[PDB]
Design a protein around this ligand. Structure first.
Ligand SMILES: C[NH+](C)c1cc(NC(=O)CNC(C)(C)C)c(O)c2c1C[C@H]1C[C@H]3[C@H]([NH+](C)C)C(O)=C(C(N)=O)C(=O)[C@@]3(O)C(O)=C1C2=O
Ligand SMILES: [Mg+2]
Ligand SMILES: [Mg+2]
Ligand SMILES: [Mg+2]
Ligand SMILES: [Mg+2]
Ligand SMILES: [Mg+2]
Ligand SMILES: [Mg+2]
Ligand SMILES: [Mg+2]
Lengths: 201, 320, 132, 304
RNA sequence: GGACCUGGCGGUGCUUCAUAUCCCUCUAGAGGAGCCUGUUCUGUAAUCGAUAAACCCCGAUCAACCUCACCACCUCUUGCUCAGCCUAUAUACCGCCAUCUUCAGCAAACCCUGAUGAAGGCUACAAAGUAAGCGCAAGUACCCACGUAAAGACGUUAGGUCAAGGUGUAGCCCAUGAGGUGGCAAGAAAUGGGCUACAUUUUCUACCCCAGAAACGAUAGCCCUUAUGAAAUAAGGGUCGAAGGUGGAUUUAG
């Protein structure tokens, strides 16, 4: 780390920066601050979930190809949902939603797991023990399952925006392999509902 | 190649392998013998070169001087023997080192008594040798004492031991500066020392360590037999304990309030007063306890009755 | 362990000079250089033969002032004026000293073909920076 | 010591001899001028500023040799001599006594500084107990004498200030107003010129931002300071840029525009955007490969 | 044999920790394919040295001849040398290093304790420890005081090199030394490390990231030409168009 430990984290929030924590403000004006990374931005078009998914999709430092495979996915999502409102019906239309950001976010929230499995060694044999997962771990698990179910290699010639758009609309409508594997993790934890007493934490 | 040559300091470091010789030369002597004017011969101003006879004679003198040099290396040094050759037990280290407190120990003689190679185990090294030595210092006038020195080097251990014993001396009281006052029986730990006061001219018929210690103290005539464990570092300690816990004639006279008088068979029935009390004289006589309750030694009674048959006992030995 | 120019610690009785004491990682952080010749800079040609002559000078003067060079020499080289500044001891006779000065003074001039100058600096005893 | 006295004499005479060889033969040759004269006289070229030559009064050169603690009677001078720590224990005794008589009436020194003032070696817990007693004496309502005691033991702080240095406004060109700042990140340099009004325009190496920066990430990096300070289309820029790459150049520009816009935005908001992290350089630079590795921190195959 | 002192060990207890290491975790690989390059084995008339960590693109920041010490054949005798030897011993060594070390100890000299034994020396509301010196630290290099470098003692492992050079001991001098000329570096197999891939975040072309199109993989093999060289390894083109479907156990690095 090229920053000294006294170098502090910069915070970028417009609604904070307009006006208890008054001593925090004075102390922060008396600490050194470190530089802001390139990915974060004072725009409010940004979603941190969206940027995190882009960074996890990145292969070998290509944020260009990453954002490309992300913006094409979002477009393709808007195109299909727009086709939907167009070909729809008086009432159907009011129900269909087409914000490529809410659809991604809510598909991730339906994809996230609530329980997890930890391998615990006891008596030589390894056991799969149910465990409460942290929120950071379950959000990362939802995102990583989505990315691996895009790179499953069972898609053949299909391009990445087509893959992620189809998978993510299925996940928003609560179907597909990511929901299936979350259900599989949940069902295996149930097989293992007694082995949870193996936990010491 | 002169370029691949090296310093001699470096050549020997490799030859000796002690980490796991040019002094007989003048500054201009050459094999060709071109005796110069600033070197060898002083500064008439005439360059010249000696002949085949002067060269051969000078180099013959040089090789002979080398030969006498290897002689002064290969003389023999004479080490006095202590208790045996290749031992350390009677070896006299010198006077104790002069004190940095403007002090001197010049009438003091230091003699070793035991040298042991002592080892402990280390995590990194393993067997680690430390020399442990015991020495005794005395001026033959009563002041003597022993101490242990421990080091990695024997000279350092010797120095530590003697310079510590001069600070840990005793004072031994002597009868007529030749013997002990009485008979001393003492068991120190598991070493039994039995010493008898003896008349003049009896000699030091004691264990060899006791002989050296009593030569450092000034005791000239005494008998001593040691039994049990003969450990040197219990022998010296028990010897010093008994000899420093002697009871003298004046102390006996003061404690009992009576005259302490001598009866020698050499002089006759003549009474020889050796110690009178320095205070009042007690007038009740000493109680003649008939058939005294005293613990006798079976070796002494055996020698008295003549049933002590040994082919080792009264052997003709050298002086002291 | 690194063993390049590091005189190891003995028992605390080993006289040692500033030069010998410092290790190669102090080579211009605390020590500096004993030979100042220009060839090791960016653009020059003859640095190799300068060093080949350098080790020669060190060993010639070591064998020619036998057992009087206290510490190592300073072979500086400005212009064609090679200089062999020295720190030689105070044991041999001054006429012998002036002799070996002259002998060298002319012999390295005829070996290397330039002005060579020895500026001795007599010292009583071999200096001690620290006892290792 | 006679050593110290003759060293002093020799410095004085040599200092005057030093002003002769130079040219300041008038008597007052200061210590800075002494350092200046020896620098030139014999060129250093040694990385350690102690390994270079020097000409100070023997006082600073030679250390503090403690005086003899007993005369020619034996009879040591201080009454607490046989503690071996006369100065420290005399100070602790005194501080305890002032706490006592004050109770009857009613930053901090570092260990090395205290050892320098006492000319005696000290334990860390001894220092800690001394500091504890001194804090007991300030916490207790003490008088002006014990105040000068606490203040001859307390030392300076040398606080710094973390207000961003505002560049002057150069009212120039024909009649416009600008600020010309600089920025650097990952071998890239950007000198930026920002005029107070102008409604938006960049000229990065002659062309606009849509031409020099085809990547929307770079355009976001160029937006960043304006969209923080709510002055998006209210100033205009012109930037010269050398070295680096597609993101390093944009970061250097971002820093330069922020450090130039500081003069056009208020001081509370320049503090606010310093807190937001647009006014500090990024010290993250590429590291060095090492001999025997396969990268800067990357190693080879098997080692265990 | 009894009892100890010190150290090492314990599938040794309690506590506190490791953080790129201890696990759960995170990213990219190895192990599967081809090629390159070391090593083992086989082979040859055909060097030597490294050989768990701490050998295995290692002496080599480098062998067509030279290098070269190997082999074959043929020659030379005060031989470039007040010869020589790359002969044997790294278990005689200097030299320069590996390793613990991604440690903090090593300690002269004293003093005390242990009935003056091997040994041991802790309590800050303090019970005997005091300490020069080396080491960490500190100071320096690079862009900061951060990070990375350098640095890391005593010793351990008779750890690595008599072949870098020097060299003790023992040997040769018709020889084991010296020179010339020509060959030695091949795979029924195996293994270590890399390089490139098995494509769709891909492939080719422009552009150097707003297009068109496709819907793959040899730096191998054979042929041509060129570079350098007395004498071809390298380079470009042509040709071809392998096996290969992201690799189990185990493992590496951050
Ligand atoms: C046979 N052993 C007792 C032995 C003997 C000698 N030398 C002699 O005794 C010869 N002495 C004469 C020449 C007759 C005077 C030896 O010289 C050696 C060794 C042992 C080896 C072992 C080596 C081995 N290496 C090759 C992998 C090894 O396991 C290690 C290791 N630490 O990894 C070694 O210690 C080893 O390298 C080694 O040092 C040995 C010898 O040097
Ligand atoms: Mg004998
Ligand atoms: Mg190293
Ligand atoms: Mg070997
Ligand atoms: Mg040969
Ligand atoms: Mg290092
Ligand atoms: Mg350091
Ligand atoms: Mg060996």
């Amino acid at each position: 780390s090229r920053y000294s430990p006294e170098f502090k984290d910069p915070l970028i929030d417009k609604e904070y920066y307009r006006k208890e924590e008054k001593y925090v403000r004075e102390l922060k004006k008396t600490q050194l601050i470190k530089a802001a990374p390139a990915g974060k931005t004072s725009s409010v078009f940004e979603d941190p979930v969206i940027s995190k998914f882009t960074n996890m999709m990145m292969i070998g430092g290509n944020k260009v190809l990453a954002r490309s495979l992300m913006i094409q996915t979002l477009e393709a999502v808007k195109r299909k949902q727009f086709e939907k409102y167009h070909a729809a019906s008086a009432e159907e239309q009011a129900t269909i939603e087409r914000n490529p950001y809410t659809i991604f976010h809510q598909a991730l929230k339906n994809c996230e797991p609530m329980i997890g499995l930890v391998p615990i060694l006891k008596g030589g044999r390894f056991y799969q023990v149910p465990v409460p997962l942290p929120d950071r771990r379950r959000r990362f698990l939802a995102m990583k399952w989505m990315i691996t179910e895009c790179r499953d290699k069972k898609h053949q010639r299909t391009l990445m925006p087509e893959k992620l758009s189809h998978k993510l609309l299925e996940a928003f409508h609560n179907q597909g392999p990511v929901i299936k594997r979350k259900h599989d993790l949940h069902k295996m934890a149930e097989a293992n509902r007694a082995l949870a007493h193996y936990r010491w934490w | 190649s002169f370029f691949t040559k090296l310093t001699a300091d470096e050549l020997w470091k490799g030859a000796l392998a002690e980490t796991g010789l040019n002094r007989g030369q003048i500054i201009g002597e050459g094999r060709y013998g071109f005796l110069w004017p600033g070197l060898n011969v002083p500064l008439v101003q005439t360059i010249a070169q000696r002949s085949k006879e002067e060269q051969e004679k000078v180099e013959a003198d040089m090789i002979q001087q080398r030969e006498e040099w290897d002689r002064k290396k290969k003389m023999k040094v004479k080490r006095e023997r202590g208790w045996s050759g290749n031992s350390w037990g009677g070896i006299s280290l010198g006077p104790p080192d002069p004190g940095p407190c403007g002090e001197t120990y010049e009438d003091f003689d230091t003699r070793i008594l035991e040298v042991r190679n002592v080892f402990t185990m280390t995590a990194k090294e393993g067997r680690k040798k430390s020399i442990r030595v015991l020495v005794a210092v005395g001026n033959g006038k009563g002041a003597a004492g022993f101490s242990i020195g421990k080091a990695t080097d024997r000279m350092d251990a010797f120095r530590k031991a003697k310079n510590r014993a001069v600070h840990h001396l005793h004072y031994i009281e002597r009868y007529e500066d030749h013997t002990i006052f009485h008979d001393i029986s003492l068991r120190f730990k598991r070493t039994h020392i039995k010493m008898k006061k003896q008349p003049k001219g009896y000699g030091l018929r004691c264990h060899r360590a006791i002989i050296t210690i009593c030569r450092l103290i000034g005791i000239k005539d005494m008998y001593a037999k040691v039994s049990g464990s003969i450990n040197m570092l219990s022998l010296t300690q028990g010897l010093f304990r008994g000899l420093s816990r002697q009871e003298t004639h004046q102390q006996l006279a003061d404690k009992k309030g009576l005259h302490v008088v001598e009866i020698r068979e050499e002089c006759g029935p003549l009474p020889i007063v050796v110690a009178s009390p320095r205070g009042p004289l007690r007038k009740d006589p000493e109680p003649e306890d008939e058939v005294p309750d005293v613990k006798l030694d079976w070796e002494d009674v055996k020698t008295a009755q003549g049933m002590k048959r040994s082919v080792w006992s009264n052997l003709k030995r050298a002086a002291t | 362990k690194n063993r390049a120019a590091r005189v190891r610690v003995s028992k605390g009785d080993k006289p040692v000079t500033y030069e010998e004491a410092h290790a190669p990682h102090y080579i211009a952080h605390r020590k500096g250089w004993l030979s100042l010749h220009t060839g090791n800079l960016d653009g020059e040609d003859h640095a190799a033969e300068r060093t080949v002559e350098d080790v020669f000078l060190r060993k010639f003067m070591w064998g020619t002032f036998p057992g009087c060079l206290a510490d190592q020499l300073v072979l500086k080289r400005r212009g064609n004026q090679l200089e062999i500044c020295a720190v030689v001891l105070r044991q041999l006779s001054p006429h012998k000293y002036y002799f070996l000065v002259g002998y060298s003074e002319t012999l390295l001039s005829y070996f290397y073909k330039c002005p060579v100058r020895l500026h001795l600096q007599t010292v009583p005893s071999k200096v001690v920076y620290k006892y290792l | 010591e006679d050593f110290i006295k003759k060293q002093i004499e020799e410095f004085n005479i040599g200092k005057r001899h030093l002003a002769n060889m130079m040219g300041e033969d008038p008597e007052t040759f200061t210590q800075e001028d002494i350092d200046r004269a020896i620098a030139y006289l014999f060129p250093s070229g040694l990385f350690e500023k102690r390994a270079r030559p020097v000409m100070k009064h023997p006082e600073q050169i030679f250390p503090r040799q403690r005086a003899i603690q007993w005369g020619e009677d034996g009879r040591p001078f201080h009454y607490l001599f046989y503690t071996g720590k006369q100065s420290y224990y005399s100070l602790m005794h005194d501080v305890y006594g002032m706490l006592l008589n004050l109770e009857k009436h009613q930053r901090w020194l570092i260990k090395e500084e205290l050892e320098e003032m006492l000319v005696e070696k000290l334990s860390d817990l001894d220092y800690m107990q001394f500091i504890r007693l001194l804090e007991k004496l300030l916490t207790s309502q003490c008088g002006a004498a014990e105040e000068e005691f606490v203040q001859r033991f307390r030392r300076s702080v040398t606080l710094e200030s973390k207000k961003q240095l505002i560049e002057p406004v150069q009212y120039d060109e024909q009649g416009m107003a600008f600020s010309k700042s600089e920025g650097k990140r990952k071998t890239a340099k950007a000198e930026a010129i920002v005029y107070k009004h102008g409604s938006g325009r960049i000229k990065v190496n002659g062309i606009d931002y849509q031409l020099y920066f085809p990547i929307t990430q770079d355009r976001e990096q160029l937006m960043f300071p304006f969209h923080f300070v709510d002055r998006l289309g209210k100033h205009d820029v012109t930037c010269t840029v050398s070295g680096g790459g597609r993101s390093a150049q944009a970061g250097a520009i971002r820093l330069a525009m922020a450090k130039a816009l500081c003069s056009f935005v208020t001081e509370d908001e320049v503090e606010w955007m310093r807190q937001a992290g647009l006014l500090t350089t990024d010290p993250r630079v590429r590291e060095r490969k090492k001999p025997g590795q396969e990268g800067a921190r990357r190693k080879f195959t098997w080692k265990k």
